[PDB]
Ligand SMILES: [Mg+2]
C-alpha cells in the first residue's frame with residue numbers, strides 16, 4: 736500500500752471518444768457524423784418532437800383531464 | 808557430387824560443405840538432421856528416381872543457427888477511400904551445413 740501502487744478496479748475507467756485524430760482511430764475526418772446534411776453541422780439538429788413538418792404526435796392527440804390539488 | 812532434397816515445401820540442390828537456409832525446423836542447434844527423401848544424386852554418373860526418391864539416398868546435415876530474416880513492411884492503401892494499414896514481418900529460418908551425401 737503505497738502511493739505508486741494503488742490501482743483502479745478493472746472496467747471502472749473507460750477512455751473517452753476523441754474525434755478527428757486520424758484514420759487509425761476510426762473517428763477521423765468526419766468524426767462519426769456522416770456526410771453533409773443538417774445533422775453534420777455545428778450546432779445542427781432539430782428540436783424535440785419534430786417529425787419533419789408532419790403534425791407531431793403530442794399535437795395530434797387530444798388533451799385530457801385536470802389536476803386535483805387535493806391529491807398533493 | 809550434388810544431391811536434390813525437399814525440406815520446407817521447397818527443393819534444394821546441395822553439395823558437401825555447403826550451408827543452406829531452410830524453413831524453421833524443430834531441432835536444437837548442435838543436433839544432426841537426416842533427409843531421407845533424396846530426389847536425385849549425381850556424382851560421376853547420375854541416379855534419378857524411377858519412383859520419387861532414390862532407394863538409399865540419405866543427406867546428413869548439422870543444424871547451425873536459428874534466426875529471423877530481414878524485416879519487410881506491408882503497406883495497404885485505398886485512394887479517396889480514407890483507408891490505410893501498415894504491418895511488419897520477420898520470417899524464421901534454420902541454417903544447416905551439409906556434412907555427407909550417401910548414395
Ligand atoms: Mg469507419
Ligand SMILES: [Mg+2]
Nearest residue numbers: 765769770771
Ligand atoms: Mg465534406
Ligand SMILES: [Mg+2]
Nearest residue numbers: 769770771772
Ligand atoms: Mg448527400
Ligand SMILES: [Mg+2]
Nearest residue numbers: 769771772774
Ligand atoms: Mg446525415
